[PDB]
Subunit: 401 residues, 2 copies
């Protein structure tokens, strides 16, 4: 026998399957709407020009490759809090926060979760929206927390079920943890409006809930970094000491370089030093310390007012191409004669959209049309191009007419 | 009235204390023997030329920054296994193994610990040498395992307590996990000679123990990749399906790029698939996927027969320099006429060295001599240079005459 005779084959990764089925398809019309990363108008990976600039300008300094501190590159950390909280945020001025570099936004979720596990004595329950990023569940579980949920997605309108959310949130046991997507909710693309965000905050504050924000799309979401981070900022301003996860995968296109941060906002700088030392104690035994490249690229962009300003324009480009595809898809559905309401497609934010398609319809799109998407009807808008958007709208109309 | 009021400040980092005491030291004969990375003869970081070269071919290639698969970059993984086992190994030829890319050697250790915790149903117990790398303890603890020790260092001889190790390993409950440093034990520098490894291997095989190899210094240790990974290879050859953490922090000076691998040797190719699915399921909720840049570097080096030969030479150069500092620090101690035996300094391997020094002679070495090193008598041979070896020889004689 053997050590691992009893280790079972894991279940198939659904998203990868869709992707591999797409690659094997000879149909010349086929489309990949399961890709989980930005594509430009010809369906190609897109390394931002500002990232290329920063990179050339880094190779020029003949930098070493030594270990960073456990919390990573100090200037990346500080810039990254500024990115999120904004320039003169009182949190920044009073120093009442700590930020650590992590292994993209997944590492920040994991680091944050492990910190809740050890120090958040008030609860073991993390409430996730229905639905949420599929990884959220295994990260908190493996970290040693428990998952619950709150009503978010409205299947009846393909929008925000505000009344359900607010009812659920206002019943969460006091001092539980609430997880909130800061904007561009993955997988649905559905976000509360400023006005609704306000009332969630007021409940969170009133019931004394701990707020945990996942922010993987600042700037990429709408092209506007300040709008996108508005809810995190507002919770902080109603005096809610959030913690926060940032990713630079999508808004700088650094996907495989793994650049993100985790930030806890505290009562004062003293409490932040304490959380900091304990954050470092949790990081050292996961990976000792974080990687150099992507944090240098990112630090260089954020601290150089020209590169920064150039980077923001590139981000607006990306958000705009996405918004354009949403708008086009919709108007093409009108052109094709569909009588269904499609406005969700444009109210939603970011690169993911719940189309509203049922599983049987998804099978038709794939079999009859070679449109590839997950069975929950989520499309990756990044796979839509001005070149394929007419075909798409025809296929969607066909299977729903 | 705050979430974290009860979160305590962490203990101080002994080493840092020491590093930063050094930098305050104002005498200019001062030495930092507590530095955890390779330094060259002028005490400076060292990017290897083959690394600069590889980086260059890569920048020329103009590649994207898209996500790696959960397992990481295939060619780096395949090349990584070949480094460790030697190509032409029966393991690689039958495909009975899985190698995944991880966040350097720490991440490999944490990933394998999590694997153990979840699928090693025979035991919670993980046996570390006395002493082992400091981070081994919290890595295994946070992952959910228990720690034991077995005798390894022998303060009477500053060598390997062979017969203690054997007696201890013999009394390990069957089907426990045994962690073995592959070459260049850290912190002592003490290794078993081959014939002694032969004897640990046949006990491990007789008492049905699971052999967990931590190999952070292949090549770096002695300057011969094959001699360094001999012990690992011998275990496998004897029928022990070990698992294995690789680091490239020290042998390619990729410290902050975080390039590592975790390899489980298996009974056959089928088992390796099953073990692979589950490693994927474990990695995904820690950090999703691993960083690109260092893996790209290492695969470029390892797959070009030209760069690979060149890199091995520079590796051989690092190992010889360290060896050279050891031999001269022994030479000089005899020429200062000390009467204590110091064969241990040249018998030891790699860049850490247990001197024999008691904590009082270490204090004297700081106060009276500006030689900084930890209280346990560990020196980093890398902070020793041909400029300062004479001084250190002298100082060490002064405190031990």
């Amino acid at each position: 026998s053997s050590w691992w005779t009893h280790v079972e084959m894991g279940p198939p990764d659904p998203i990868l399957g869709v992707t591999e089925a797409f690659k094997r398809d000879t149909n010349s019309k086929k489309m990949n709407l399961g890709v989980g990363a930005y594509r430009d108008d010809n369906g190609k990976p897109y390394v931002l020009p500002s990232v290329r600039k920063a990179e050339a300008q880094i190779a020029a300094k003949n930098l070493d490759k030594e270990y960073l501190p456990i919390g990573g590159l100090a200037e990346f950390c500080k810039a990254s809090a500024e990115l999120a909280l904004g320039e003169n945020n009182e949190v920044l001025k009073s120093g009442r926060f700590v930020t650590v570099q992590t292994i993209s936004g997944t590492g920040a979720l994991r680091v944050g979760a492990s910190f809740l596990q050890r120090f958040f004595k008030f609860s073991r329950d993390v409430f996730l929206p229905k639905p949420s990023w599929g990884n959220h569940t295994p990260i908190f579980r493996d970290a040693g927390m428990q998952l619950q949920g709150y009503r978010y997605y409205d299947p009846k309108t393909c929008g925000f079920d505000f009344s359900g959310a607010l009812e659920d949130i206002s019943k969460i046991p006091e001092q539980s943890v609430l997880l909130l997507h800061a904007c561009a909710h993955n997988p649905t693309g559905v976000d509360p409006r400023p006005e609704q965000w306000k009332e969630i905050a007021s409940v969170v504050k009133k019931k004394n809930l701990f707020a945990f924000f996942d922010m993987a799309y600042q700037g990429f979401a709408s092209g506007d970094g300040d709008k996108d981070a508005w809810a995190v900022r507002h919770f902080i301003e109603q005096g809610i000491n959030v913690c926060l996860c940032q990713s630079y995968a999508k808004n700088m296109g650094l996907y495989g370089e793994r650049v993100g941060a985790f930030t806890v906002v505290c009562k004062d700088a003293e409490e932040a030093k304490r959380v900091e030392s304990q954050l470092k104690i949790l990081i050292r035994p996961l990976y000792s310390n974080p990687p150099l490249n992507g944090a240098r690229i990112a630090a260089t962009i954020l601290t150089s007012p020209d590169l920064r300003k150039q980077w923001l324009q590139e981000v607006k480009g990306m958000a705009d191409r996405i918004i354009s595809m949403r708008t086009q898809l919709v108007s093409n559905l009108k052109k094709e004669g569909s009588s269904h309401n499609w406005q969700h497609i444009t109210d939603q934010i970011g690169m993911f959209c719940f189309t509203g398609l049922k599983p049987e319809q998804v099978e038709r799109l794939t079999k009859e049309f070679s449109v590839y998407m997950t069975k929950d009807g989520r499309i990756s808008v990044a796979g839509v191009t001005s070149g394929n958007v007419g075909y798409l709208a025809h296929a969607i109309h066909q299977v729903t007419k």
